Structures are given as structure tokens and as C-alpha cells.
Amino acid sequence: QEPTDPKFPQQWYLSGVTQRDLNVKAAWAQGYTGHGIVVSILDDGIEKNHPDLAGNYDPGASFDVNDQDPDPQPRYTQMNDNRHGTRCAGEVAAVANNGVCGVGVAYNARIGGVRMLDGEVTDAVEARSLGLNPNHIHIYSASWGPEDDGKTVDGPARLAEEAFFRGVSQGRGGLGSIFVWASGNGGREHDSCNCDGYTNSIYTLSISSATQFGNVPWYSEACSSTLATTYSSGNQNEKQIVTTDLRQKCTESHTGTSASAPLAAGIIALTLEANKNLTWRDMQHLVVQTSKPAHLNANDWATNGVGRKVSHSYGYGLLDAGAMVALAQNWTTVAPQRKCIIDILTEPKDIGKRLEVRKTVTACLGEPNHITRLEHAQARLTLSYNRRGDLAIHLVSPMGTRSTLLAARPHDYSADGFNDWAFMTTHSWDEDPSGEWVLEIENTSEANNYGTLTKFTLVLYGTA
Numbered sequence: 001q002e003p004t005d006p007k008f009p010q011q012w013y014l015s016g017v018t019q020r021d022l023n024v025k026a027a028w029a030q031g032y033t034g035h036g037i038v039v040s041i042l043d044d045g046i047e048k049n050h051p052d053l054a055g056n057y058d059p060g061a062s063f064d065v066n067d068q069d070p071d072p073q074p075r076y077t078q079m080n081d082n083r084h085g086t087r088c089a090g091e092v093a094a095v096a097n098n099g100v101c102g103v104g105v106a107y108n109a110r111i112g113g114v115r116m117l118d119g120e121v122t123d124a125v126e127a128r129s130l131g132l133n134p135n136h137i138h139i140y141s142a143s144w145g146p147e148d149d150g151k152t153v154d155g156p157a158r159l160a161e162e163a164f165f166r167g168v169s170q171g172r173g174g175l176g177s178i179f180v181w182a183s184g185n186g187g188r189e190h191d192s193c194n195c196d197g198y199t200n201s202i203y204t205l206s207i208s209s210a211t212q213f214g215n216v217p218w219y220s221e222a223c224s225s226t227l228a229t230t231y232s233s234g235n236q237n238e239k240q241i242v243t244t245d246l247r248q249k250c251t252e253s254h255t256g257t258s259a260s261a262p263l264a265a266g267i268i269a270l271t272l273e274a275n276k277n278l279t280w281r282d283m284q285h286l287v288v289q290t291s292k293p294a295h296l297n298a299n300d301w302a303t304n305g306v307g308r309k310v311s312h313s314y315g316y317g318l319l320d321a322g323a324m325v326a327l328a329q330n331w332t333t334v335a336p337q338r339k340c341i342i343d344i345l346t347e348p349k350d351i352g353k354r355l356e357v358r359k360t361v362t363a364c365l366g367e368p369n370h371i372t373r374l375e376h377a378q379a380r381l382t383l384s385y386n387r388r389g390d391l392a393i394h395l396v397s398p399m400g401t402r403s404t405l406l407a408a409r410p411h412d413y414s415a416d417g418f419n420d421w422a423f424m425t426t427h428s429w430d431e432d433p434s435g436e437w438v439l440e441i442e443n444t445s446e447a448n449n450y451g452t453l454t455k456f457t458l459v460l461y462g463t464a
């Protein structure tokens with residue numbers, strides 16, 4: 001039976017009947033609601049006594065890292081600053097059929113929150129949050145990252161990177177923590193989200209946004225590391241996200257890519273109920289295979305080497321919950337992850353106005369890390385340049401798939417270049433990476449800019 005909650009009709013991205021939705025009712029009708037799954041929101045806290053959250057609240061999925069106590073209750077202020085985690089929690093697991101607000105995507109999942117943004121957010125704070133109770137929490141949702149000013153290059157420092165590797169390796173009984181991540185809100189600053197090391201990570205399942213009418217929202221950042229898309233806000237004729245709000249209220253104006261990641265986390269919760277044995281990599285495969293480009297407008301939809309349409313705004317397209325839970329049920333676990341390291345340069349290369357580096361690779365032929373079926377690929381680049389934001393960088397796979405690694409960033413005046421920065425693309429997923437790869441570095445300005453590429457490491461992940 002369809003939810004009876006008073007605002008469920010306003011949750012157009014779930015309740016729609018016009019095919020502009022996330023196809024969640026189809027998963028609910030297959031019997032999947034999130035029962036037995038545990039999700040945690042890493043944000044500014046969670047109103048655990050909210051009438052639409054209390055029934056699913058899980059103290060075992062929660063902690064207060066900012067004040068160092070178990071209780072993630074938000075700090076109440078006159079401007080309601082610390083409401084975001086409560087909004088995101090309801091998107092995932094707001095209680096259903098209780099006469100309050102609407103429902104969560106996974107309305108029978110258990111939901112917690114980590115209060116970790118309301119304070120000085122250090123590497124240690126991030127690590128302690130990403131690493132919370134990793135054999136109880138299945139899925140983490142994080143909407144935060146480095147400043148979206150269009151001039152920052154930053155990512156997880158050592159403790160947080162260690163937390164990512166521990167989570168995916170030993171978390172969830174060795175199946176791997178699922179870290180769902182928002183790709184950013186820096187669109188009007190012309191931000192380019194591979195410059196955000198959290199969303200650019202292979203260990204995060206990164207999500208962008210589409211407006212109700214199927215367009216790229218003003219706030220969206222394009223990048224090759226994004227995997228897929230959920231609906232969120234757009235212009236003032238387009239509806240927004242409807243969910244739980246601070247002070248036991250219900251909001252119809254939750255917005256941004258930061259509202260897209262929680263919806264993805266709920267869909268992933270339904271999928272994990274359908275197959276509890278999925279690994280962190282399995283889950284990314286399911287997203288790649290089932291997501292839907294149709295009716296998302298972008299001028300960069302390109303067909304990759306295995307016939308999938310991919311966009312830097314949308315990844316593989318809109319998440320499809322019904323298809324995710326269906327494919328999950330008989331999914332065969334992927335083979336162990338291989339990693340093929342190819343150091344490319346024999347000498348430093350002057351960049352000048354334009355540099356092209358071509359290299360034919362065997363992808364570790366004859367070795368235990370031989371890869372014929374790519375998952376993520378990275379170009380780890382070390383270079384100097386006098387104005388970083390004038391650079392644009394592309395990587396072309398042997399199958400001809402052109403991934404933008406970096407778009408021009410007008411505000412990025414930095415003279416510090418890139419220091420072994422691991423630009424990541426999802427767009428060659430399932431391609432055979434043997435053959436010629438091409439790296440393109442271009443000065444997009446008319447200025448006489450200058451610099452040097454001193455290291456190019458092609459890193460291939462995948463299977464055979």
C-alpha cells in the first residue's frame with residue numbers, strides 16, 4: 001500500500017506517476033523497505049526525538065564527535081543553523097504511515113547521525129566519524145567537503161584517508177563500508193569537482209543532482225569522478241526536497257547536491273536489503289549498470305566503449321531503485337580488486353600552451369594485477385603552472401572515451417600546481433584498458449602561461 005503520510009504527495013521524486021522519479025515505489029512493491037539496514041548521516045547532528053525519526057532512530061549509528069559524547073542532538077540556535085543532518089536523516093528513513101510529514105526512501109531502515117560539523121572539523125574529527133561503529137553501520141551519508149569557492153584543491157588528510165581504506169577493507173564484516181557522497185554545490189563558482197578529494201575518491205559513491213524538469217541545477221559541479229544522480233532543487237518553478245526539519249517540523253525546501261546524497265543512500269539501503277552480501281564495489285557496479293540517462297538534459301552525453309551513456313554532470317544517470325533491488329538479488333560478487341600501476345613519463349614535459357602525452361599500455365599483462373575489465377582509473381599528476389585555473393585536462397581511454405579530469409576554474413589563481421593529485425574517472429567502467437591512453441593539458445587562457453609536468457602515473461583498478 002502507498003504511504004498515507006500527509007506530505008507524501010509532495011515528495012514528487014518518490015510519488016510521481018509521470019516517470020520523472022527515482023522508481024522507488026517499484027522497490028517497495030518488490031517488498032524492500034530497508035528493514036535490517038543501518039544508515040548514518042555525518043553532518044551537524046540529528047534530532048533523534050523528531051516525531052518522524054524517533055521510531056527508526058538508532059543510537060548505535062550515532063555519536064557526537066564535536067562534544068565527545070554519544071548524543072548527536074543538534075545545537076539549537078535562533079537561525080536554526082544545525083538543521084541539515086535532520087533534513088538528510090528524514091530523506092533516508094523518515095517513518096511511514098504515521099500521519100507526520102512524508103516518508104524516507106528506506107522507511108524501515110534504522111537511522112543515526114554523527115554530530116561532527118558543528119565545531120572545528122579536523123582530520124581526526126573526520127576520521128572518527130567515517131570510522132564510527134563500522135560493523136554496525138552499513139551505509140554512511142556525507143554531503144560536506146572542501147570549500148566550493150572554485151579555487152580550492154583539497155581532500156582527506158592521512159587519518160581520514162586511513163578511515164576510508166579501513167572502512168572499505170574491514171568494515172561491514174569485510175564487505176566494506178558504503179560511503180555515499182555529494183559531489184558539491186560549487187556550480188556558480190565554476191568549480192570542478194575532481195578538485196574535491198572526498199568525492200574524487202574511488203571509495204566514495206558520488207552523487208550529483210537533477211532539477212524537476214530534468215536539467216543541470218545552477219549549483220551542480222561537473223566532474224569525471226561522479227557516478228550517478230538523484231533529483232533535487234532547481235529554479236523557483238521547480239519543486240524541492242520534502243523532509244523532516246529541526247524543531248519537530250516538516251520542510252518543503254531542502255535543496256542542493258547535499259540533498260541528493262541522502263536519497264541515494266536510501267536507495268542503496270533498499271538494495272542492500274535485497275542482497276546483504278554486496279561488497280562496496282558490487283554496489284558501484286549496480287549503480288553503473290542500472291542508472292538511467294533518459295530525460296536528463298546535458299550537452300555532454302557521450303557513449304563510452306561498452307555502449308553506456310555517461311555525462312560529467314550526471315555520471316551514468318538517474319538512480320533507479322526498482323532496477324537496483326531487482327539486479328541485486330542474483331548478483332554474483334565481483335572478483336577481487338586488482339591495481340595496475342603505470343608510471344608514464346621518461347622525462348619532465350614542458351606544458352606551455354598545450355601538452356599531449358600518449359602512451360600505449362598492456363595493463364599489467366602477464367601479472368596478477370592484469371586488468372581487462374576496468375572499474376575506476378586515475379591519472380596521478382604532478383605539475384607546476386603559474387595559474388592553475390587556466391588549465392583544462394582530459395584523459396582519453398583506448399576505447400576513445402574522453403574523460404574531463406579538470407575544467408578551467410576562473411577563480412583558481414593558485415601558483416602551487418598539483419602534487420600527485422589522483423584525478424579519477426568512472427566513465428571507462430567495464431572497458432578494456434589495454435591500448436593507447438592520451439593525456440591532454442591545455443592552457444585555456446590567451447595568457448602566456450608556463451609550467452612543467454613532472455609525473456604522470458596511470459592507475460587502473462578492476463578485474464580480469
Ligand SMILES: NC(=[NH2+])N/N=C/c1ccccc1OCc1ccc(Cl)cc1
Pocket residue numbers: 084143144145146147148182183184185196219233255256257258
Ligand atoms: N563540496 C561539498 N560537499 N559542498 N557541500 C556543500 C554543502 C553541504 C551541506 C549543506 C550545505 C552545503 O552548501 C551550501 C548550499 C546548499 C544548497 C545549495 Cl542549492 C547551495 C549551496
Ligand SMILES: *[C@@H]1O[C@H](CO)[C@@H](O)[C@H](O)[C@H]1NC(C)=O
Pocket residue numbers: 277333
Ligand atoms: C558472500 O559472497 C562470498 C563471495 O562470493 C561467498 O563466499 C559467501 O558464501 C557469500 N555469503 C552469503 C551469505 O551469501
Ligand SMILES: [Ca+2]
Pocket residue numbers: 064067069070071072073
Ligand atoms: Ca552531544
Ligand SMILES: [Ca+2]
Pocket residue numbers: 005052094095096097098099100101102103
Ligand atoms: Ca512520516
Ligand SMILES: [Ca+2]
Pocket residue numbers: 146147148149183184185186191192193196221
Ligand atoms: Ca567543489
Ligand SMILES: [Cl-]
Pocket residue numbers: 339
Ligand atoms: Cl590503492
Ligand code: NA
Pocket residue numbers: 181198199200201202203204205206225
Ligand atoms: Na567518489
Ligand code: NA
Pocket residue numbers: 302303304305399400401
Ligand atoms: Na565513444
